[PDB]
Ligand binder design. Structure first.
Ligand SMILES: *C\C=C(C)/C=C/C=C(C)/C=C/C1=C(C)CCCC1(C)C
Ligand SMILES: *C\C=C(C)/C=C/C=C(C)/C=C/C1=C(C)CCCC1(C)C
Ligand SMILES: *C\C=C(C)/C=C/C=C(C)/C=C/C1=C(C)CCCC1(C)C
Ligand SMILES: *C\C=C(C)/C=C/C=C(C)/C=C/C1=C(C)CCCC1(C)C
Ligand SMILES: *C\C=C(C)/C=C/C=C(C)/C=C/C1=C(C)CCCC1(C)C
Ligand SMILES: CCCCCCCCCCCCCCCCCCCC
Ligand SMILES: CCCCCCCCCCCCCCCCCCCC
Ligand SMILES: CCCCCCCCCCCCCCCCCCCC
Ligand SMILES: CCCCCCCCCCCCCCCCCCCC
Ligand SMILES: CCCCCCCCCCCCCCCCCCCC
Ligand SMILES: CCCCCCCCCCCCCCCCCCCC
Ligand SMILES: CCCCCCCCCCCCCCCCCCCC
Ligand SMILES: CCCCCCCCCCCCCCCCCCCC
Ligand SMILES: CCCCCCCCCCCCCCCCCCCC
Ligand SMILES: CCCCCCCCCCCCCCCCCCCC
Ligand SMILES: CCCCCCCCCCCCCCCCCCCC
Ligand SMILES: CCCCCCCCCCCCCCCCCCCC
Ligand SMILES: CCCCCCCCCCCCCCCCCCCC
Ligand SMILES: CCCCCCCCCCCCCCCCCCCC
Ligand SMILES: CCCCCCCCCCCCCCCCCCCC
Ligand SMILES: CCCCCCCCCCCCCCCCCCCC
Ligand SMILES: CCCCCCCCCCCCCCCCCCCC
Ligand SMILES: CCCCCCCCCCCCCCCCCCCC
Ligand SMILES: CCCCCCCCCCCCCCCCCCCC
Ligand SMILES: CCCCCCCCCCCCCCCCCCCC
Ligand SMILES: CCCCCCCCCCCCCCCCCCCC
Ligand SMILES: CCCCCCCCCCCCCCCCCCCC
Ligand SMILES: CCCCCCCCCCCCCCCCCCCC
Ligand SMILES: CCCCCCCCCCCCCCCCCCCC
Ligand SMILES: CCCCCCCCCCCCCCCCCCCC
Ligand SMILES: CCCCCCCCCCCCCCCCCCCC
Lengths: 282, 282, 282, 282, 282
């Protein structure tokens, strides 16, 4: 059966670890937001979407993680028997689905931004991906939170299945876009995009796995394993992979500048190598 | 007869779904605000008003949606019989009228900003539209919230009628402005404006319809349908259509640059096609 | 006698209307703040003071209106007999005097910024105006709030009289500055300043009138009329007239650019007419 | 004996006046912060420290004054016998010492920034001044707040004496720096610095005087006089004198530009006279 | 044996001093954040990482210190017997470990940013350092907070030992990077980096020492000594040493500009000496 994670009483260790990771995440996102803002003009206007998506995703994550922290502080009470969940502990689990609903479509927008697609294909791509990913999150939220208060095993499973269909649709769309890109890019750029895609699409699998952990039992330790693992995953994907597309966009900006297709006000540096020189509109 | 939406007790599913959409909206607006800010200089000084209106509308929406979220958390209490409305549940419904009062006039300002009107006509247009739209919202607020606490069917209806007159005035003004524009623009620009207008003016109809749903009865289902539908509509219109005028303004900037009427510091890209090159004041 | 406004019990309609206007104001100011910030570089460095004053005034208004909203939510308690003022309701009335104390001197700074005055006269002007206006607000605050808790009719009147002397001093100073300007400006600029002054100085009269309403009796109606009217006045003067000086400053920037006295990085547009072209320091 | 200021019960007038000045200060600082930010690029990179110090000081003041306002609202309760101090009223007095601890060293940094000192002397100057001033504040905090809860007359006095030694050290350092500057500046610049120093160093005396007013007795009148006087002093020194160094820095920037030692992207204006023209790096 | 710091009752002096330092820190960080932001463009794009890391670290510190202040206000209750720790007092100690978890890896990123390393070595360096330092903090958090609620002496010690291994790894990595840099830099730059490294790595020792103070007993004195000393250390290292790398980055920018390897829009000043002139992309 499904044993909802927010039913469990947390040990002190457990409650302490959760607060640590939750706040470390929020602070890492603040740092990431600052970095992304300070470096927004390393990218040409042609790829500004990549930058905006990413800065958006980091802002969203930062706010969502503030809510999660509030929900956590207002969701358990120390009672000699550790910390006992109140009726707002479900909101620690809900807010995360909230956050993914915005953030994951932003990720698709970012990745498509640095691909080589034009016109209808590019608008079709962005429509299907943003749709399929928000649907994928919402189906999850249905199974895990909304129907029967999380407790209906058949709902819980069936909605995860539906969710997995939207997950395959999103991937196919993205994977195809990245692989219609690669023929038109330069070796260095081809490589960079291929690698960014993989990094950006591979760690999605974590989420579905964590989703099904409520099936193996209910414990404060299982709850801590769920909340922590999701927090780490979010930091790795949103923060850790926040520079993959930035490097792609920078190396693309620089190639345009070297081809005389554009100019850029400052030199561009990637891995401490100069990619392009500063130049003025001539 | 009118059954006010804030009278109904919400199931857990219902209360969970509402919080989801409300917060997803707030987070989508934060993302939108960041995008609009990061891309404010893609537009020439001639059309900066379009940008400011839009960035204003997104900032307003973001704050309004924070209030709505507060009002929601402070408006229902879990009581075994789901969530029971308290005396601040009306403020969940009131805050939205508040938000439209600023946001809808901002929308009119934005659309007129990218039209081809000069002098008195342009000042008359903006005066009538900003007036007619704020009046339209306020009449709504009267019928639905203020008179008799929402419960007077004849008020509720009569004020919606008055509201619909201000709605026709606004449309006529706007529609005429857009159609005095189109003769002077270029094919590509003509098309773009025509389409932006339609997108921007068509989904207004949703609001009046939702307004009259408190007449079909009272339920937490119905209450939930109301709050969600309004949230989706807001996201579609404020966020979804936040780029229509931006593209119009960009393509207008670029045409000036190509005509030698202006210069722009960076190249302009629309749908991954280069519209204009960067240039310096010569 | 004086019947203090914060003594009255508010109907539900009344309490609803007040919250509407108060929050609509705050949101309008957020929009205004964003506009003013986004357009700060339409003005040359010579007139940057106008811009800073205005952006300051809008920031102040936005914060003050947040306080007023708090004070309102924490100042009346629903009790079957509508909303009954607690002992913090006075703070709804006090915060507004607070706000004017900063905002009105900012207005004088803004208007003098776009006048044609040099050296001692300009420093004397700004000193007398900023003094006379802050004094004018403080005398008001004395009569209405501080002495006898607002209830002393002779105080209430006598301090309003004193306040009116500082009001005449401020006007004389300002009016003379604007009329020593006009001889040195261009027709187009002369006209623009004259008009901005009138708009900026005419709606001051509202405030003194509203000030003496507590003398015609006490009612929640009267209390509501007071709070709303002040809110509308603030929006009209701070937001509505936030572009008068901006246009003046823009047309002055542009005239310098056309005379070859300065350069400006971007073209300047006023009412959809181009005033000056972009240019580089030569 | 010392009668601590936070022991006194405040009349309604008194409590009203205090809240007025405290919030007027916070709002004035917001305005000042906005001005300083909007005008940060009127100064060359050579004197950017002056700007950063000042913008820092205004940000600090704004936050400190928000705390003081909180502390005030949470420090007295209306009890028929006016407002009666709780055991957090001391924090109204403590927060101010907190604020000076950052702000006064920032002031020294700002003033030294616009002086003509190089190498060791400049690093020695900044070290002694920042040290002596933070020490001066902390000694004050000891005598007034920490030892014996403020109530030890001999502590109170002895720590103020120590504090006055650090005050003389700071002045000597600063005064000497300003007077080793003046021989190397231009008449116009010499004059400007001399005047800025005097303005910046003269109103320090207020603070020590107010410090000893708890020795003349205890009253809500006296308590009110203390809190208001400190608030006015802060506004005069932090806000009122926030442009003295800015003018100094601007006139220094402009002189470099006129000497061909630097360039500046925009013209520089001081008192409505043009000081330097815009120019590009040649 | 370990006597947890959050067990002790604080005298009034003690509670007053702690609040002072905690808030002085937060305010110093706000000032630092403003400085770093205002001066972000003194550094070339090649070394922007240094700037972003530092601005990130200061933003993180500012938020962390706000939490610590909250935790403090909500962690002790005045009970005639001074201030008595409640059960959130542990969170005053926990939040600091939280803060170091982000901030210390940011410090390593900053220092490596201004070193002369390319390709794999630079990516290996940053990976090991960011890992080793976050591990070092987390091991600390285990021993001090999580296991046995802080009270297990053998845990407390053993985890500090493990922590010290990660501390040696981090240092070796960093020290080697800085000393593979120095052969390729200029005298002036070599010197500057060597000095920045020492300053940046030397005051790490404080933290481990303070960590083992809970072993010398329990007291409010000892508790106070701990919290203050950590606060001062943080201010010295995060704020005090926030300019070391900035100077390094500036002098490196300037050397590139003098070599004709880059251009920089503004002149660069270090210690009131001009390092490079402004220039345009040629
Ligand atoms: C914050 C960033 C990311 C990439 C979060 C991703 C979330 C998913 C990939 C969720 C997928 C789900 C599936 C496919 C099936 C079970 C329900 C889930 C929503 C967890
Ligand atoms: C937030 C964006 C938009 C466009 C909101 C629009 C609101 C309306 C178009 C409201 C119209 C009304 C009418 C015409 C009649 C009933 C009362 C309403 C206020 C709902
Ligand atoms: C927020 C903007 C404005 C211009 C507010 C203005 C306030 C006044 C002009 C107040 C004037 C007063 C007078 C002359 C006499 C009675 C007391 C008052 C303060 C209301
Ligand atoms: C916020 C700005 C300023 C300049 C505040 C200044 C504070 C002082 C100059 C304080 C001086 C003190 C002395 C010399 C002796 C008594 C203790 C004091 C801290 C009040
Ligand atoms: C906020 C800035 C800094 C540099 C903080 C540094 C923290 C450490 C160097 C901590 C080291 C530890 C060790 C090596 C052993 C005991 C556990 C500690 C985490 C305190
Ligand atoms: C070939 C280029 C595309 C690779 C993307 C691979 C993503 C895998 C995720 C399941
Ligand atoms: C990947 C992250 C793994 C997190 C594991 C958490 C284990 C918590 C155990 C608590 C008793
Ligand atoms: C008593 C619990 C001790 C171990 C907790 C483990 C915490 C999980 C760490 C995951 C690593 C993140 C990268
Ligand atoms: C080159 C890549 C830069 C940063 C990548 C972060 C990877 C995070 C993985 C965590 C296990
Ligand atoms: C677009 C929003 C769709 C909301 C659907 C809600 C489904 C809830 C079913 C369980 C009760
Ligand atoms: C700026 C663009 C923001 C995109 C946010 C997407 C919101 C959720 C869409 C799917 C449901
Ligand atoms: C630039 C700011 C304009 C905001 C518009 C607010 C409209 C208020 C209600 C109109 C009736
Ligand atoms: C703009 C002016 C706002 C006027 C507000 C009028 C309120 C009328 C409501 C009557 C309800 C009883
Ligand atoms: C000819 C261009 C017309 C643009 C607007 C079309 C109608 C908008 C929606 C009306 C309801
Ligand atoms: C394509 C033009 C039609 C757009 C309809 C938009 C509906 C929005 C509903 C909120
Ligand atoms: C846009 C469409 C949104 C539809 C919302 C439907 C909500 C259904 C709630 C049912 C509760 C029993
Ligand atoms: C070109 C971008 C269009 C915005 C998305 C439209 C949203 C419609 C949702 C149904
Ligand atoms: C530049 C900032 C100035 C703001 C105005 C300060 C308030 C004036 C108080 C006068 C009494
Ligand atoms: C000719 C100059 C006019 C100045 C403005 C007059 C405003 C009067 C308000 C009383
Ligand atoms: C507040 C009321 C403002 C009224 C201002 C009207 C004067 C404009 C004349 C042109
Ligand atoms: C200039 C703005 C005029 C506002 C008038 C407000 C009238 C309030 C209606 C009274 C409510 C109780 C009946
Ligand atoms: C010659 C410059 C002297 C500066 C004097 C500063 C004012 C002294 C206050 C004691
Ligand atoms: C020209 C001398 C200036 C004296 C300023 C005094 C300020 C006192 C308030 C602090
Ligand atoms: C600067 C001078 C401020 C003086 C404040 C006097 C306050 C009197 C309160 C009496 C009750
Ligand atoms: C700026 C000067 C502030 C002076 C404040 C004086 C307060 C007097 C209040 C009289 C109350 C009866
Ligand atoms: C008594 C208060 C003294 C403050 C004066 C501030 C000095 C301003 C510039 C001379 C803004 C235009
Ligand atoms: C940017 C620099 C910030 C300086 C903050 C000053 C803190 C001084 C404390 C001294 C005791
Ligand atoms: C760019 C932001 C990186 C911040 C570092 C995150 C914390 C690392 C934890 C190990
Ligand atoms: C040669 C430069 C060596 C690096 C300086 C830091 C050495 C001191 C660090 C103490 C742990
Ligand atoms: C270095 C910082 C030293 C801090 C010492 C604090 C002493 C507090 C004693 C309280 C009784
Ligand atoms: C900077 C160093 C901090 C100094 C703290 C000393 C605390 C002494 C308190 C005396 C009771």
């Amino acid at each position: 059966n499904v044993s909802v994670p927010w039913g469990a009483t947390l040990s002190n260790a457990e409650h302490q670890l959760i607060f640590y990771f939750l706040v470390v995440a929020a602070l890492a996102f603040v740092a990431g937001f600052i970095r992304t803002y300070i470096t927004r003009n390393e990218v040409g206007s042609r790829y500004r979407t990549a930058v905006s998506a990413r800065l958006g995703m980091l802002g969203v994550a930062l706010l969502a993680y503030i809510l999660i922290i509030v929900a956590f502080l207002l969701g358990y009470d120390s009672t000699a028997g550790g910390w006992v969940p109140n009726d707002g502990a479900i909101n620690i689990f809900s807010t995360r689905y909230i956050e993914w609903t915005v953030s994951v479509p932003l990720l698709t927008i970012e990745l498509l931004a640095v691909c080589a697609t034009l016109g209808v294909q590019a608008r079709r791509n962005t429509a299907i991906a943003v749709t399929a990913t928000g649907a994928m999150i919402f189906c999850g939220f249905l199974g895990a939170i909304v129907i029967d208060n999380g407790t209906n095993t058949g709902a819980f499973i069936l909605w995860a299945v539906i969710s997995c269909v939207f997950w395959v649709i999103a991937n196919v769309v993205l994977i195809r876009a990245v692989r219609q890109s690669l023929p038109t890019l330069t070796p260095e750029s081809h490589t960079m995009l291929k690698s960014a895609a993989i990094v950006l699409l591979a760690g999605w699998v974590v989420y579905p796995i964590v989703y099904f952990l409520p099936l193996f039992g209910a414990s404060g330790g299982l709850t801590t394993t769920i909340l922590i693992t999701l927090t780490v995953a979010d930091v790795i994907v949103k923060l850790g992979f926040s520079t993959q597309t930035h490097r792609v966009a920078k190396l693309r900006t620089a190639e345009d500048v070297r081809a005389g297709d554009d100019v850029h006000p400052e030199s561009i540096w990637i891995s401490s190598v100069k990619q392009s020189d500063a130049g003025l509109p001539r």
